Design a binder for these strands. Structure first.
Ligand code: ADP
Ligand code: MG
Length: 429
DNA sequence: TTTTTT
């Protein structure tokens, strides 16, 4: 099935030595998130796959970085204390892992990598960066950046010159090679690739955007015989469209249950979970026993009182039960600080998958999509949504595509000049 | 106003 480009073998040779870290970039559809599936199948018996988002982790066969390394939400400064301790089952994992793969690195905060470094340096008991573990990063800096809430930026701008993964402070202590894939796969249309890559480079003309006028077509909603999908910029449109696609003339509501104090905004799951038979669903957590990792997709076969039966896209059937989330914070017992749980919520780890966010959709491939991008945005978000689909016809838009939707980021322009000046390499040598 | 733990 797969084709090995001259650059891919060239990339394969660079990582044959242990001491070289490599960042593999390329345009959307260049075959990077694919090529890493091909790399896993040779070197030693070691590798770990991970990504920032649960879905891109599924797309690469890995897990989330926060679940793998036990990273709490929010930035960790070098002065911040390490909150979570690895178990003995997890320590053997990281110790036996001789190679680390991070898919879709563009969405990774720089403090996360330094949290990876500090946790790897301690679990390996070594002063070498990342515990001396080889790291290979896949992603396109021109897709979209991480989050990057405003409260967390001013906090990180104390210790960090930039908010992008390469700004991490471990790159004072080490560095990485950069190789780009110049061949596109996902789209076979030459005129559609041209306008795509021009959306990516911020250099594009309104005569090329004329090609996207056909995306205003309302043509076919039908049918579920190979279906259709919605990708929205904001979670509110995803929330409405999923409920819009479920008429609720039929069936179930599943209510959450809260013990003690669990603030609304901090609740990870649905307060009232509404589902019918044949409803698109997404697994919200990781269970190795049942076998559903977070980010997987499925469809509801049956709805009972305490059990939901779902047939996943991978072909495996899972019976979902109620998952319990624990809310723990910092309080005072005795005289001392304590981690005690101040509340818990319980619901099924499922949510309606008909719609979705460009953020969650990054890395995915589709034959037919329905793009919702209105005039509301965040940088690089449009290039992602367009490039998900293989064909220009399969794309359906809510509104006309305008240059207003393009938000350039000039730090990526400077970063490209930097490493291309030295041997396609960034950081310390 | 977008994601993400043991
Ligand atoms: N070397 C390759 N050979 C054949 N098809 C490929 C190759 N690389 C990618 N593809 C195809 O391109 C599409 C998306 O691939 P993917 O690697 O996930 O995109 P990206 O490089 O932007 O992360 C898939 O349909 C895949 O089959
Ligand atoms: Mg990808």
């Amino acid at each position: 099935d797969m084709i090995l480009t001259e650059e891919m073998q060239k990339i394969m040779n660079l990582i044959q030595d242990d001491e070289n870290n490599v960042f593999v970039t390329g345009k959307a559809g260049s075959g990077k998130t694919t090529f890493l599936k091909y790399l896993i199948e040779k070197s030693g018996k070691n590798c770990i796959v991970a990504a920032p988002t649960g879905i891109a982790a599924i797309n690469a066969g890995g897990v989330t970085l926060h679940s793998l390394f036990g990273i709490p939400f929010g930035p960790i400064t070098p002065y911040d204390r390490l909150e979570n301790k690895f178990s003995e089952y997890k320590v053997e994992l990281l110790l036996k892992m001789e190679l680390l793969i991070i898919d879709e690195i563009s969405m990774v905060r720089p403090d996360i990598l330094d949290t990876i470094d500090r946790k790897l340096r301690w679990v390996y008991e070594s002063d070498e960066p990342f515990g001396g573990v080889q790291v290979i990063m896949f992603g396109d800096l021109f897709q979209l950046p991480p989050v990057t809430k405003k409260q967390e930026r001013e906090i990180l701008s104390d210790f960090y010159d930039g908010f992008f993964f390469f700004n991490a402070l471990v790159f004072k202590r080490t560095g990485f090679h950069i190789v780009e894939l110049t061949k596109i796969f996902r789209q076979t249309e030459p005129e559609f690739i041209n306008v795509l890559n021009n959306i990516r480079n911020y250099q594009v003309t309104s005569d090329e955007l004329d090609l996207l006028s056909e995306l205003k077509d309302r043509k076919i909603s039908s049918s579920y015989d190979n279906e259709y999908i919605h990708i929205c910029t904001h979670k509110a449109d995803v929330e409405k469209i999923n409920a819009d696609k479920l008429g609720e003339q039929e069936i179930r509501n599943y209510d959450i249950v809260i013990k003690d104090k669990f603030p609304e905004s901090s609740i990870p799951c649905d307060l009232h979970l509404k589902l019918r038979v044949g409803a698109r669903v997404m697994s919200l957590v990781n269970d190795s026993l049942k076998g559903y990792y977070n980010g997987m997709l499925g469809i509801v076969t049956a709805l009972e009182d305490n059990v939901i039966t779902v047939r996943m896209d991978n072909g495996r059937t899972i019976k979902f039960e109620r998952y319990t989330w624990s809310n723990t914070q910092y309080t005072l017992k005795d005289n001392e600080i304590v981690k005690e749980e101040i509340g818990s919520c319980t619901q099924f780890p499922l949510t309606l998958a008909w719609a979705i966010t460009i953020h969650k959709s990054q890395g995915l491939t589709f034959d037919k999509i329905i793009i919702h991008v209105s005039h509301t945005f965040c940088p690089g978000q449009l290039y992602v949504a367009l490039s998900r689909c293989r064909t220009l016809e399969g794309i359906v838009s809510d509104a006309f595509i305008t240059k207003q939707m393009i938000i350039p980021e000039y730090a990526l322009i400077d970063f490209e000049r930097a490493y291309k000046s030295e041997g396609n390499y960034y950081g310390k040598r």
